[PDB]
Amino acid sequence: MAEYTIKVTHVVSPNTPKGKGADFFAKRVGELTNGKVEVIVFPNSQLYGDGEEMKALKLGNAHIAMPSFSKFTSLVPEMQLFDLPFIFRDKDHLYKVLDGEVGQILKDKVSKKGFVALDYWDAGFKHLSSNKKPILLPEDAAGQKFRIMSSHVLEAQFKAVGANPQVLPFSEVYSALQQGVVDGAENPLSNFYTKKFNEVQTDLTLSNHGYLGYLVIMSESFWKKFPKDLKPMVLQAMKEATEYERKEAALDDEDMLAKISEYAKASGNLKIHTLTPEQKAAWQKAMEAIYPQFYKTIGEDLIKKVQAVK
Numbered sequence: 099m100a101e102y103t104i105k106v107t108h109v110v111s112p113n114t115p116k117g118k119g120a121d122f123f124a125k126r127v128g129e130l131t132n133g134k135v136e137v138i139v140f141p142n143s144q145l146y147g148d149g150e151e152m153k154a155l156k157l158g159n160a161h162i163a164m165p166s167f168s169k170f171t172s173l174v175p176e177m178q179l180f181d182l183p184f185i186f187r188d189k190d191h192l193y194k195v196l197d198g199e200v201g202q203i204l205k206d207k208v209s210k211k212g213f214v215a216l217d218y219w220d221a222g223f224k225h226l227s228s229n230k231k232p233i234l235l236p237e238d239a240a241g242q243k244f245r246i247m248s249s250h251v252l253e254a255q256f257k258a259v260g261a262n263p264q265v266l267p268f269s270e271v272y273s274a275l276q277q278g279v280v281d282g283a284e285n286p287l288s289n290f291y292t293k294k295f296n297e298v299q300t301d302l303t304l305s306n307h308g309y310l311g312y313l314v315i316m317s318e319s320f321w322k323k324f325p326k327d328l329k330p331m332v333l334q335a336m337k338e339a340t341e342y343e344r345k346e347a348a349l350d351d352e353d354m355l356a357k358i359s360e361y362a363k364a365s366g367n368l369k370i371h372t373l374t375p376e377q378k379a380a381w382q383k384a385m386e387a388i389y390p391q392f393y394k395t396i397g398e399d400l401i402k403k404v405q406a407v408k
């Protein structure tokens with residue numbers, strides 16, 4: 099019935115803001131094209147995972163993806179800017195950066211490496227968890243193995259507090275925590291609960307120590323070939339979906355914290371720790387110390403532009 103089909107691939111649960119956003123995109127394309135185009139969304143790495151999605155887009159075997167910033171850092175080193183610990187003060191700060199000058203500079207870089215860069219999507223600020231002991235101060239992280247996404251900034255960040263970071267694809271994280279391959283991880287609350295990382299960690303600290311978000315991209319050769327008269331509807335669909343995703347993400351921390359809290363009370367197998375300002379300061383000092391290592395590959399003046407956004 100559909101004359102054309104589009105394959106979206108991502109690594110998260112459909113129950114997250116990002117997953118709901120992809121499904122909303124898919125639904126709106128269908129409606130706006132009166133059934134001529136059908137978008138099929140493969141979540142949870144069903145079609146391609148962290149390690150395979152990029153090439154897939156290059157070759158046109160997948161059409162649309164929404165990778166986290168860290169996932170771009172081998173193609174575009176500067177995207178590591180958004181991984182720096184404590185770089186974003188809050189969501190107001192974030193969105194002024196993402197929908198402003200710096201956001202555009204990084205889109206443009208991705209565009210040059212052969213992807214069609216569209217909009218930024220939100221996950222949330224990241225939190226430390228462990229199976230070994232409570233993480234209250236930098237001191238506690240020392241000697242522990244942590245999963246990270248593939249980013250030199252994140253491996254520097256954990257090295258700075260004496261931990262052992264290890265890159266693993268998102269789809270392997272639950273099993274790796276369950277089997278002791280790593281002691282802990284850092285996640286936004288959205289991924290922490292929807293992937294059941296809560297069921298395989300004994301301690302969660304609301305550290306808010308770094309940010310995780312996404313850049314929607316499309317396959318350049320898919321887009322080159324896609325029919326000119328149907329492109330406007332795809333683009334409108336995505337615009338609407340971006341607005342919708344960010345609304346779902348605003349709700350998300352409160353909803354997820356309630357669910358994680360109920361799980362901890364009912365199961366007795368998770369303690370949730372909040373930090374004192376004293377504790378927060380110490381995290382900021384230890385983790386920001388890494389910034390100068392990255393003036394060369396990210397750009398000192400780029401980091402300063404972000405810090406200056408009021």
Ligand SMILES: [Cl-]
Pocket residue numbers: 351352355
């Ligand atoms: Cl909250």
